[PDB]
Amino acid sequence: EDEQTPIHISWLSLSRVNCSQFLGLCALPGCKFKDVRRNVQKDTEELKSCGIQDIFVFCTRGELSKYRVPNLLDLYQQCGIITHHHPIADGGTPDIASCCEIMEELTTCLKNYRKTLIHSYGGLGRSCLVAACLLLYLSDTISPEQAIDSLRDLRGSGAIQTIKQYNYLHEFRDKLAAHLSSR
Amino acid sequence: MENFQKVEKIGEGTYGVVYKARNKLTGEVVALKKIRLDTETEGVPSTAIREISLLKELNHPNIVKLLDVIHTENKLYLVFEFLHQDLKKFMDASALTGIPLPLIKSYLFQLLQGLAFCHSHRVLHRDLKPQNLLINTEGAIKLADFGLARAFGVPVRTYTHEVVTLWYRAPEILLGCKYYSTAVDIWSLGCIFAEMVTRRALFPGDSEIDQLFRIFRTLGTPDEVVWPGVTSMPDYKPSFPKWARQDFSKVVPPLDEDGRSLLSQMLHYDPNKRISAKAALAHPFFQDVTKPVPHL
Ligand SMILES: Nc1ncnc2c1ncn2[C@@H]1O[C@H](COP(=O)(O)OP(=O)(O)OP(=O)(O)O)[C@@H](O)[C@H]1O
Numbered sequence: 137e138d139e140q141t142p143i144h145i146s147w148l149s150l151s152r153v154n155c156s157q158f159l160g161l162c163a164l165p166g167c168k169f170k171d172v173r174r175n176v177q178k179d180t181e182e183l184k185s186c187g188i189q190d191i192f193v194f195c196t197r198g199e200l201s202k203y204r205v206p207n208l209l210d211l212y213q214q215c216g217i218i219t220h221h222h223p224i225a226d227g228g229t230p231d232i233a234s235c236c237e238i239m240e241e242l243t244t245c246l247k248n249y250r251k252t253l254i255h256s257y258g259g260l261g262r263s264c265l266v267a268a269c270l271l272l273y274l275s276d277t278i279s280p281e282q283a284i285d286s287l288r289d290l291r292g293s294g295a296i297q298t299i300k301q302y303n304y305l306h307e308f309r310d311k312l313a314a315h316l317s318s319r
Numbered sequence: 320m321e322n323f324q325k326v327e328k329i330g331e332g333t334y335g336v337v338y339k340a341r342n343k344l345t346g347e348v349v350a351l352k353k354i355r356l357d358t359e360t361e362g363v364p365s366t367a368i369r370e371i372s373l374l375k376e377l378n379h380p381n382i383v384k385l386l387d388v389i390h391t392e393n394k395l396y397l398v399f400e401f402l403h404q405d406l407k408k409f410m411d412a413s414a415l416t417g418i419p420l421p422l423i424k425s426y427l428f429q430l431l432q433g434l435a436f437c438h439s440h441r442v443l444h445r446d447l448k449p450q451n452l453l454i455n456t457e458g459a460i461k462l463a464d465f466g467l468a469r470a471f472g473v474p475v476r477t478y479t480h481e482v483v484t485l486w487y488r489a490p491e492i493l494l495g496c497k498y499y500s501t502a503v504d505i506w507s508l509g510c511i512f513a514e515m516v517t518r519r520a521l522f523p524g525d526s527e528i529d530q531l532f533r534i535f536r537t538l539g540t541p542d543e544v545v546w547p548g549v550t551s552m553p554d555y556k557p558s559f560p561k562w563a564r565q566d567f568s569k570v571v572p573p574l575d576e577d578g579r580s581l582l583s584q585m586l587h588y589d590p591n592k593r594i595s596a597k598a599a600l601a602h603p604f605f606q607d608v609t610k611p612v613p614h615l
Pocket residue numbers: 329330331332333335337350352383399400401402403404405446450451453463464466
């Protein structure tokens with residue numbers, strides 16, 4: 137069991153949103169908290185062993201230290217990984233303008249065949265939300281209902297856990313458009 | 320390492336174990352708990368300081384007697400009053416032939432009270448669920464894991480890592496509302512009650528949106544009428560489906576008139592309308608409430 141088992145990565149197919157790419161999801165690399173501890177460096181290496189170019193992190197300096205992975209971003213830095221920090225409040229949802237950057241950058245990476253991996257702490261909340269959003273974002277035909285099942289298929293029936301997340305998903309398309317204010 | 324006798328594992332939930340044991344002297348029972356820090360750990364274990372506290376301030380019949388505690392630096396242990404098994408066990412080991420309609424009430428009743436006792440001390444249990452309700456040979460039922468027990472007015476706070484069970488959460492908390500009340504505990508029991516009855520857990524949850532909908536699909540998609548002020552509840556949405564109440568006729572037929580009105584009120588949407596712990600211990604339903612002794 138645990139910590140010395142190589143770091144898992146759930147590869148989500150983006151074909152049903154008509155993309156050939158795959159997006160990757162995992163839990164905090166190196167996380168040491170509640171019945172969960174690991175080796176940052178080692179996990180971090182396995183990723184590079186795994187082929188990872190770009191990495192999207194949704195924690196917060198606040199969280200990186202609380203899980204004892206302060207330098208995480210750096211270990212990523214000096215490991216060949218282009219990291220994109222996009223903290224999302226814990227137990228929260230991103231503001232549309234932030235959530236928007238994520239979709240963009242994320243999309244680009246894929247458009248440009250980059251081995252992209254995303255994560256927050258638990259990988260069952262924030263990251264599922266964000267991945268679910270990219271589905272609604274690469275397709276105007278896919279239903280919130282569906283994208284959810286997509287992640288549930290990927291990560292378990294505990295996919296989008298919260299209700300705030302569920303609501304957020306059903307309103308992403310609107311709020312995203314409502315970001316119509318080209319300005 | 321302490322004059323004692325670890326014999327059997329009565330339990331082991333969320334980072335911790337609850338071995339059974341005897342006084343390495345005159346024996347005389349024991350439900351010795353256990354919890355672990357190891358120093359160089361996150362802010363000491365809170366699991367407990369407050370839980371040992373509230374356990375002290377609280378001293379009532381239907382409330383586990385925290386006999387003692389051994390503060391050892393290595394790992395912290397809490398001597399508890401051993402008590403055979405919890406209600407999940409019992410409930411389970413009875414789910415085919417059911418539980419005695421009386422023993423049920425004898426059990427619910429001793430609970431409402433013990434509950435209303437804490438409530439009266441300005442406390443919310445919050446972790447009410449079968450595995451946390453203990454029973455004994457004579458038909459006596461106590462409360463436990465005051466591990467999430469806090470004093471009135473604690474706010475609802477959610478964490479990415481804090482991913483719990485939910486089977487027993489009340490609609491006001493799922494729909495998002497700063498802080499919670501005692502109405503919550505009178506809802507966990509709502510469920511738990513209708514579960515000793517029908518034998519199967521009332522609303523099984525995997526995601527908050529499922530937890531709800533189940534409830535709504537069973538208890539009707541609440542409208543302003545039954546619950547003044549929903550359509551304003553942070554995470555409410557006109558969009559959710561609108562399931563018309565699934566009349567008790569399917570919900571708990573094994574019951575009667577009293578039970579079927581209590582539960583009804585015991586699982587009311589409006590927290591401000593949901594019945595009180597004391598207002599419960601009254602109800603005609605508990606009239607001839609004896610203390611059936613169970614068989615295990
Ligand atoms: N005094 C006791 N007598 C009998 N069984 C007990 C006693 N105290 C604890 N248990 C058993 O231990 C478990 C409950 O322990 P406890 O409340 O410490 O657990 P927890 O993991 O901290 O909380 P939870 O069970 O709510 O996850 C149950 O399986 C219960 O049967």
